[PDB]
Amino acid sequence: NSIQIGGLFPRGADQEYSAFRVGMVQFSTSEFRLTPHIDNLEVANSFAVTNAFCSQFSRGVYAIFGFYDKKSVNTITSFCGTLHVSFITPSFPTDGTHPFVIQMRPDLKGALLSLIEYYQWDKFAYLYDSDRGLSTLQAVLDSAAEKKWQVTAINVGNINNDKKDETYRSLFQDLELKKERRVILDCERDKVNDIVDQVITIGKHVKGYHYIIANLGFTDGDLLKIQFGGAEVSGFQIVDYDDSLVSKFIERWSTLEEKEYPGAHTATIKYTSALTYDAVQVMTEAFRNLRKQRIEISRRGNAGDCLANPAVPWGQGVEIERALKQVQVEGLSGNIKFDQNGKRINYTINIMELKTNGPRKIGYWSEVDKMVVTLTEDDTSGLEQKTV
Amino acid sequence: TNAFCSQFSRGVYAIFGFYDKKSVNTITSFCGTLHVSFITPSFPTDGTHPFVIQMRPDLKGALLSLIEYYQWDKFAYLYDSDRGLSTLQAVLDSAAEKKWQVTAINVGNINNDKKDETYRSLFQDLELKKERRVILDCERDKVND
Amino acid sequence: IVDQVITIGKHVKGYHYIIANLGFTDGDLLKIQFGGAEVSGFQIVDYDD
Ligand SMILES: *[C@@H]1O[C@H](CO)[C@@H](O)[C@H](O)[C@H]1NC(C)=O
């Protein structure tokens, strides 16, 4: 029982592929076995993505797991929506209803707007990356008219390789011109790391500044460097390490050799890798349920060419999509459930704060509640003088 | 992608056509890879894209200069995503540099279904307070709507 | 020490540091360079010779 599936990874994805293998081994069963075909390629090049996809389709896979960028997303959604091949991804959710695409990554918009509303910011600067996507920008801009906000949006995404460190000094000093202490980041962990590092270099991490790191991994990058700064830093965490399942995972994860499973020896794991693992679980449950529901999905013939005119799609793909979207499980990212579009529904995003003794969980965010406050409310005698 | 891979098989020397925000990356990537020259009247790409000739002239500079000419320090900006978000970044950075109060609203790309329902209250909320200056960035038909 | 100073963020323009050692430019000076704080030290090897 070999089930051929496709996988598409960037040339710069190590821990993700490692976690993929971890999912392959941990969730492998005796009933059936998945047989992954792996292709490392440049994600930004649509031609390369298309080439690899037509190759995978020539192999005749049942489902494809992979990543995409703002350049290659339309190719993926259009091709999968065309040929009826199921696609699973950790990458950013598309804006719209895109069929045959399962976005494992949950939406952060609600939690962010709820957070800004929580801290009552009426004026701030918002740094955005064009290399990822401009959706959240539109979100907070449209929200600015309703909530009466003064938002100064700056693109950090257009920066050269050699001159990229000037634009940061100019940015922060122009913010000295605007005298605005509240900032939001939302970028790649590496780009974020560079930003934080330059914040430390210019030394704007002193008390009085307030930063919001918008990403799902709060603890994935090194944020220890800004910890003793004195500036308040809030972010979101999708992987709660205080869970039994997560701990039993980290136990095995930490016991892996870094030579065989790159960047897996760490006790902390990037949320993307976690999403990959959970994706493996989900696919496994989906095909297991297909065999359990007595639905014959095996293709008797070859799918052949993806460029055949007119395009002839296979039928079992619909059944696979239905199987995938109807999966409800428990992974590293918490409760996993999908809607008819494939987006994540009913998820819990921990709201985290960075203090002196490290990160602490203040909130828990949901789609329906839109807000939840954990007890918190610590009181100290320090800097509180009982009246005389 | 299919039509491009075709006709190229016929061995054409140059390809003339149009593109949208969804298919633009396909055209530019494929033409930049296979070295097939592509001509378009549609919106210019944001960046340096080789083997692509954008016949359409840039409109950002003229817009910012016109806005500066009418001396508007506060205005509303309605935009569609189908032509690109470059002009948006332009007016945002120009708002940061020239100290403008710009209220930009996207009606484009159907980015939110919510708004469609009870959008009138929004437009009227901006209609009661200020909003003396408005700029339309859309398709001729969308403009008409 | 310098690293702990930048981490706690006392390298702002109000503070003044003196490196008394023979190598001033031998250590990593990029990190406190952009701080805005004045840092003066001693150098025994003149590269202008
Ligand atoms: C999420 O759906 C679950 C099933 O895990 C249920 O326990 C709970 O109702 C949920 N939260 C909401 C807001 O429906």
Beta-carbon separation of A203 and C8 below 8 A: no
A46 Cβ under 8 Å from any chain B Cβ: yes
- CB-CB contact of A203 with C13 (8 Å): no
Q: Are the Cβ atoms of A46 and B25 closer than 8 angstroms?
A: yes
User: Residue B81 contacts by C-beta under 8 Å, 6 or more apart in sequence?
Assistant: B21, B106, B108, B109, B111
Q: Cβ distance A278 to A332 under 8 Å?
A: yes
Angle between helices B120-128 and A135-147 (to 10 degrees): 60
Under DSSP, is residue A295 helix (H, G, I), strand (E, B) or coil? coil
Torsion of CA A152, A153, A157, A158, to 10 degrees: -70
d(CA A198, CA A226): 11
Report how far residue A224's alpha carbon sits from residue C7's, in angstroms, rounded to the nearest whole number.
9
How many CA atoms are closer than 13 Å to the CA of A125, on its beta-carbon side? 24
CA torsion angle A243 A245 A248 A254 (round to 10): -80
Give the technique used to solve this structure.
X-ray
Q: Six-digit token pair at A226?
A: 């800004």
On whether the CB atoms of residues A70 and A128 are closer than 8 A, the answer is no
Closest to A87 in 3D by CA, of A75, A134, A306, A299: A75
**Contacts (Cβ under 8 Å, ≥6 apart) of A221:** A189, A190, A192, A193, A196
Buried/exposed A66-94: b ≥16 CB within 10 Å, e otherwise: bbbbbbbbbbbbebbbebbbbbbbbbbbb
Resolution to 1 decimal, in Å? 3.2
Half-sphere exposure of B105 (CA within 13 A, CB side): 20
Q: Which residues of B touch A307 (CB under 8 A)?
A: 2, 5-6
**B to A contact (≥3 Cβ pairs closer than 8 Å):** yes
A375 Cβ closer than 6 Å to some ligand 1 atom: no
CA atoms within 13 A on the CB side of C6: 20
CA distance B65 to B49: 26
Q: Please tell me the residue having the least CA distance from ligand 1 atom 1.
A: A346
Q: Which residue has the tokens 């840092």?
A: C39
Q: Are B19 and B52 in contact (CB under 8 A)?
A: no
Q: Which residues of A touch C8 (CB under 8 A)?
A: 228-230
Give dist(CA A7, CA A366) in Å, integer: 31
CA A203 vs. chain centroid, Å, equals 29
DSSP string, chain B: -HHHHHHHTTT-SEEE----TTTHHHHHHHHHHHT-EEEESSPPPSS--TTEEE-SPP-HHHHHHHHHHTT-SEEEEEE-SSS-SHHHHHHHHHHHHHT-EEEEEE-GGG--HHHHTT-HHHHHHHHHS----EEEES-HHHHH-
Q: What token pair was written down for A26?
A: 């941990």
The H or E element containing residue A39 is strand A33-41
* d(C-alpha A274, C-alpha A249), whole Å: 10
Q: Do A230 and C7 touch (CB under 8 A)?
A: no
Q: Which amino acid is at A150?
A: Q
